[PDB]
Amino acid sequence: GQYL
Amino acid sequence: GQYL
Amino acid sequence: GQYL
Amino acid sequence: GQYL
Amino acid sequence: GQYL
Amino acid sequence: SPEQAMRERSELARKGIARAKSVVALAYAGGVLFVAENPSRSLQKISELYDRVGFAAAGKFNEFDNLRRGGIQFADTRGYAYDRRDVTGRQLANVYAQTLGTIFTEQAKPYEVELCVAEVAHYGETKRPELYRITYDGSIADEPHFVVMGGTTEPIANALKESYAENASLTDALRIAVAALRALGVASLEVAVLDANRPRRAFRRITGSALQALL
Amino acid sequence: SPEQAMRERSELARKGIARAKSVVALAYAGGVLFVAENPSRSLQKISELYDRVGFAAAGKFNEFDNLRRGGIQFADTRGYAYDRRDVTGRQLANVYAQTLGTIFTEQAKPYEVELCVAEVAHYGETKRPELYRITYDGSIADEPHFVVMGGTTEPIANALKESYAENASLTDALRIAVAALRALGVASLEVAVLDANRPRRAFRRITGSALQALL
Amino acid sequence: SPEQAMRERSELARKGIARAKSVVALAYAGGVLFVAENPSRSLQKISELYDRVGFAAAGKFNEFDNLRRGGIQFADTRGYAYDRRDVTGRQLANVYAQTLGTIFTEQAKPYEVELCVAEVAHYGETKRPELYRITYDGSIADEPHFVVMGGTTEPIANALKESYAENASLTDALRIAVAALRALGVASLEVAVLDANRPRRAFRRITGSALQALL
Amino acid sequence: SPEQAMRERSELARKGIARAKSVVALAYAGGVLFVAENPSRSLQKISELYDRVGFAAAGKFNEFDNLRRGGIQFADTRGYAYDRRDVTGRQLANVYAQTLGTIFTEQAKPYEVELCVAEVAHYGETKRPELYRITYDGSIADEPHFVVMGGTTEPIANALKESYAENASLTDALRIAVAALRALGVASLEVAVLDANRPRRAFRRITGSALQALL
Amino acid sequence: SPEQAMRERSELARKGIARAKSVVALAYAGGVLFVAENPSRSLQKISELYDRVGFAAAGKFNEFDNLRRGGIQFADTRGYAYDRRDVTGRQLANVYAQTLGTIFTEQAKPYEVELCVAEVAHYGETKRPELYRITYDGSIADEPHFVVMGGTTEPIANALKESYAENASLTDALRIAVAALRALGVASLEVAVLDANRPRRAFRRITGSALQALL
Amino acid sequence: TTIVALKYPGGVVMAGDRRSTQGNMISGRDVRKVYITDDYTATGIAGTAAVAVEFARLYAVELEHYEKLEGVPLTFAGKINRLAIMVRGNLAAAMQGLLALPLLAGYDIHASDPQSAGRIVSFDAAGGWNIEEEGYQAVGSGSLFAKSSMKKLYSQVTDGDSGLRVAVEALYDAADDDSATGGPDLVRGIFPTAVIIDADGAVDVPESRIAELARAIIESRS
Amino acid sequence: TTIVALKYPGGVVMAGDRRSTQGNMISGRDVRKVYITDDYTATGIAGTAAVAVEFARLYAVELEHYEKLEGVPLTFAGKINRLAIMVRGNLAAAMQGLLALPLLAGYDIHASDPQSAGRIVSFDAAGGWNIEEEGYQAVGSGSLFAKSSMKKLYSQVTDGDSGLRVAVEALYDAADDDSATGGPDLVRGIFPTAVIIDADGAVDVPESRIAELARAIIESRS
Amino acid sequence: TTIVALKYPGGVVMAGDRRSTQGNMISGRDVRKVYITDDYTATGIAGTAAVAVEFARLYAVELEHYEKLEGVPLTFAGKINRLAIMVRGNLAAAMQGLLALPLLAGYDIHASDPQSAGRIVSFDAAGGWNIEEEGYQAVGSGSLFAKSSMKKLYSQVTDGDSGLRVAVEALYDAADDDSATGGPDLVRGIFPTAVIIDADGAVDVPESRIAELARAIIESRS
Amino acid sequence: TTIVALKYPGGVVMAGDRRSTQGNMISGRDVRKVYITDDYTATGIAGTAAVAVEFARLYAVELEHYEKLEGVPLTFAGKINRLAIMVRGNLAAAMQGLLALPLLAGYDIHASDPQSAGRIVSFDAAGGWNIEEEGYQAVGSGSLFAKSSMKKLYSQVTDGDSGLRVAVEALYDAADDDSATGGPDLVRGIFPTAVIIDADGAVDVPESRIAELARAIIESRS
Known about the structure:
The structure is cut from a larger assembly and holds five copies of chain A, five copies of chain F and four copies of chain K.
Chain A: no helix or strand
Chain F: H1 2-18, E1 23-28, E2 31-37, E3 46-50, E4 53-59, H2 61-81, H3 89-106, E5 113-119, E6 130-134, E7 140-142, E8 146-149, H4 153-163, H5 170-182, E9 189-195, E10 203-205, H6 209-214
Antiparallel strand pairs in F: 1-2, 1-8, 2-9, 3-4, 4-5, 5-6, 6-7, 9-10
Chain K: E1 2-8, E2 11-16, E3 20-22, E4 25-28, E5 34-35, E6 41-47, H1 49-70, H2 76-89, H3 91-95, E7 100-107, E8 118-123, E9 129-131, E10 136-140, H4 143-153, H5 160-177, E11 193-198, E12 201-204, H6 207-221
Antiparallel strand pairs in K: 1-2, 1-10, 2-11, 3-4, 5-6, 6-7, 7-8, 8-9, 11-12
Helix pairs in contact in K: 4-5, 5-6
Keywords (chains F, G, H, I, J): Cytoplasm, Proteasome
Subcellular location (chains F, G, H, I, J): Cytoplasm
Protein name (chains F, G, H, I, J): Proteasome subunit alpha
């Protein structure tokens, strides 16, 4: 997923 | 298991 | 799986 | 455990 | 963990 | 292998019961007498179940405390539903055996407890006291003389069988029980009696100056 | 190891999306243009979500069809509860990201889909069209220019980047999209437009004789 | 590895479908013709779903029978809720695709069935018959000419493709279908027609003396 | 093996409790004094349960925080159903033992918390304060003089044991508690008192200028 | 081993936090300042929780978005039930800690998020702004001066500790924050302020021309 | 309240007044009671204004939702059935005074003959529906006067303008004979609203045409 | 029915009559209305006989159940609260004719001064409770007459015997002025029941003492 | 109770009285009936005071909650719909006596022309809403008198001061003709509350300005 | 029943009578109706005595429960809201006959000026609350007479002693004009209960002080  |  |  |  |  | 797991679980229950204090219940002229090795003053392993029914246990405190509460709940409900005289120690023993067996089979950790249910006759009635011993798996046994629980029961049973006396008085029964349990001081002991001479409620604790003079 | 399982699921989803047809969504003067390679006349990979919000997808058909139906149900309920103008593409994209992440984490078989949500400005109002790309794991990215999904993305993406033009006309954008997708005929293509000039509903399909005429 | 599990499930479904009787559905001037190899007289692999929508299957009888009942229930409820003319073959095909995919992913044993949904035009209306083939995993395909299900489908499909002729009469189409299905006798054949000339209900069975007269 | 799981859980809880701050509770003439080393000003490991019942804990903060909230909820409910004077520290300690044992047996991760429940006499009544120690496994211990929890408890216990003086003044008792806890500054110290001289609510915090002047 | 499994869970969460953008929350004369590196214009990592309570996070977007929504649910309900002034940042930080611990223990994948809850004083009142940092396991910490979250926090933390100035004006604090976060431009930077000078709602976003003028 | 609908060669026209009263007191002078649900369908609802607006909104939402899900609009029979179900679901609330009676006008694009593709559907309190075959229908408190005027004026309907004028005159008669229906307000410039549905879709009639038609009728009756 | 209770130096005494009627017909002549709930408190419930017996039985069971579970009897306030809750739970049945009014007498072992450790608690219809500070209380149909008699005879109360005599005389007056309350039956030898609670516990008074007291009162009034 | 609202070029002004009664008895002299639910919206609720306060609190909480969750404020139609739903949900309680009628004043920041961005919305008991386009509205027991006064005084409304004076005069007329509405209380110095919404937001009018206006009106009518 | 509350510079005082009746019959002569719910709040409840005791017990329990859980006492507005919710939830039973009307007195420790930190809150049957700004309030059957007496006597309030005397005299007037309120009983020595709240907390006024105040008032009116 969008870990940012 | 009380077999009597 | 149906991809088209 | 407790066995007192 | 939180111990303090 | 299910059999290996069952044997391991039974060994666990035996080990849990073994590393526990010993409780003795013995019949005497006035009824039934319970002596328990309990240094703690607040925790009690000797309790009343119903008017003429007393309860003793040995093992992990929380488990037989829950069993005590459940048995009291069952006995009071049964007495309200039909009558006070319809409650007998046999029904409580059977309920305890069934519940313990169900917990052993279904629950993840079996209860490491050993139970004893004692019953005396009603007022103005002659009957031999009844003692039922219940193990972790649900085995139920009727003992006519005495019941020993927890710890190493072999020396305790040998001493009792050597020193047990029918129709013994209160003082003699207490002395014999404490002497057999030694194989101690007035403190760190819980002593209770199911006294058949009482009108309705037989259970009575003997602690303090009364136990000091009695012992 | 759980990390091994997670990378295996990621590889499964990537490979499933890879063996699928390619879809492109690009902004042009009149709004947003969706071009997909779809031989089927009944199965549609491009659809409307709400008045100014359109939807495109690439992957397993029934999976993004279920996602499409869920998004339509969410949009209609949200619009009825508050207003038609309170529904935005960002909320639908966030809901899709949440649902896809939850399915990826908890469900047994992760969804092999890639979604694109496009929003155009309301009638009589100027605003740059918004494009959101949503991956199988729930990651959400904002593409200001164009979105490419399904199959081998690198050649089509590079061709679009070289041939991309802001405020291009409908026909010119259609030719550019077809050329980038080739790296096709009038049939076996699905063409749709979110047209910002429409009063209420922007979504409009361009198929058949008109689609040939623009080509 | 999960990939091996999915491969094994797909191979299991393929093996289950392969060891089964063959069904052919072909379009002709009067509508659609279903011909199946069925020695039994009580078990039926061809049935009506709705007024102009018919159903054929190949695989395990109990599974596609359950699917048939579910599709009939869905079609009847959809027709009651809105109208009879709102029920289309595409909706039923989509419902089968989604439910088959859900069963394949979620249920322990995948369904070893493969289905064909056929739709014809309404009375006094011109429209080409539509044929949808749905596989065990949830894939759906639109076939404009013919559908062959179950068993060794390659020789039958080749014979049909060599001999299939559009706008053929009922007798010619039946002869072609039975000849291609040989690659049988008067019995062990189930013949049904979706006839576009019928006013409301297009499905009609051709068995016994009428089938003998046709052949 | 199940016994292997049980033992590894035991050292897991011991390691969790060991890597935590230490709390001391000591009985003095005015009641009970709680002293803990706590750098945070908002997080508190020492709190009131009921009018004359106080609570201290050592371990993972959210765990014994939930335990504290459950104890407060239980105590307030019992007082409303019966009477404020019917709530005792013994009942709260037993309930804590029950819930801790149940969580240890049933929940996936055992709680690495260690609790202390203190009770003082009512106003105008003479009675020695009671201190209960409850461990992760459900064990409960009645300690008459002092309780030490968390971290390396051996040096603190030894110093407090040799320096313990019955009927000590508040200032002297605080000095002894700080001296044993060092083996600290005005900050990073939480000090509370169950004061038997209060009419209804015994719990009282001593922080800020009063704490600085007292020490 | 369960300990090895927990270690792997913790390392997975640490890796999830590591590959994330960094956010800095610092106290200045007028309140609290949040500075985040956010290229996206629609995705937000800074948000308001309640009138004087703000929220920042670093990690997987969907997870702390769900946590944000839950925290808003909690704060609004708590304010409605009792009063707006009864909602404090301590309660929100505590509920976040409990829910994060429960998720870590019981959910399949740990939340790869790190949260910061900031609280400022009310209107016409002086009080030092309070900062809580909450980790994936449920740990809670009170930060007197600043909080740095996400990515490689050591260089930015050292730069802030070197260059921090108490009661710094908004422009000076913003310049220091951006300089520390560099170890960025007007765009791809998100700036928000909890301004204690505002009458009721303190949260305010500083974006666009105002941010360009200030920076 | 009064809403009239009539077919003309090549389409249908549906008009409604603007007054809303609560008892004898006039509370609204510019209420819009005729809505355009789809591109080829218009719906008017008489009765409680709140329930009318609620049903119009919900019916439009339901039609659009089905069209978006299935990729094809409902047939006219399907739309009629959905409206009838909505009406029947409100019967219990109708017994409590929250009654709403709808009238539906549409253009069946799948019909064979395009000159007679207009459709008028009237619903009763029990949810039953009837496709009007006489060419006109009306709902509301002034419905009887409106229908009795249309019965005499319907021979003059031959196109869109004649049908619109006849509908406006029927509304004028209903307002003249009934105090709960508002007539053309020359002082405030508020006139009945109208919607015309034909092969090109459904369109709102501009206020200027209705205003001049109403002024012509008023001058004729003076 | 009529049940009286009164404090005397060192304890409390509580007495009750024996008659139970169904309208004007006498159905019971030996009904016992005062029960010993536990060693230090007694409860007497007036109203329907069935409901009185059920409440007494259930209250005794609940008190004994709590004492067995927790190993220590409830405080007096706890018992008062439990009885009040039981009374308040009966409002639905009370309004339909199954009414029961309890009166609770007890000896507070935890009270400071043993000479004033007796406690009398009266409950009203709505479940409220009031600790009577006037030294006497009565419930039942004849409660008004018994209270008015005790108001004059309470100056003679100095110990257990005088208190018992005053209670019996109050019951006699209540039975004299009210037909639903039974008087001392010399023909059948049935006399009101009594319970005396002091530091040594709660005991039932033997019928011989009550009989001699009733005979003395009767010959005094002859 | 009386709450008035009226538009002026560039904004809206909304005022309310201060008296609350229980029958014929005056129970409150300083009730505030106009709330600022949002930076650009105010809501005033007539009827039971408790229900009015609860609705104001709930509406403010819901609008704030949506704005916090979604990051953007609702459009005016969304706010209207939420208030109408809340009114509709109270019908069961309203018929039992807990009735509440709200009136909403707002400034549409998304409106095309700033000079006509003010909006007044009136709700009926059945949950329906109507955007007032004739310039003013009133709710409460004295709503009719206030509306009939504003109908004559509205030609003088040209800016904020003129609108505020007209609103105060309308409230004075309503209080003069209706005994449930409180007039300017010169003895205690209690005056009606007002809220002015323009492009810069919604602000409470200071009590001194309203006091001066009320005194001027009183001397004008003397 | 009658409970009065009034503010004096630096604090607040609440007083309540002692009589409780069942119709015309006196059942209680020493009922305490004023309870210290928290360190700085006192709550008097009028109506059914059972509902009064239960409400005060539940409210105090809830306040201490929140304070123990969150580690900080509620703000005064929070306490007001909790009491208002408690009153609102009892509306169904209040319509049945178990009505309770609370009056809350408090000392806001967070107030700016300690001289004006006293707060009085009055509730209606519908659950709404009002913070009284005239300085005094009363609840109960004799509330009107007590309020009309305090309206004249409030100019004499200068400190705690004068405020206490005014409260006692208001209770005297209420009892003199209403038969359900008990006046000073000099024969039995029973006087109204009072609670004084100021910066150092809430205390109960000793019986001797109220006794001498009541005797002075009685001799003044003789």
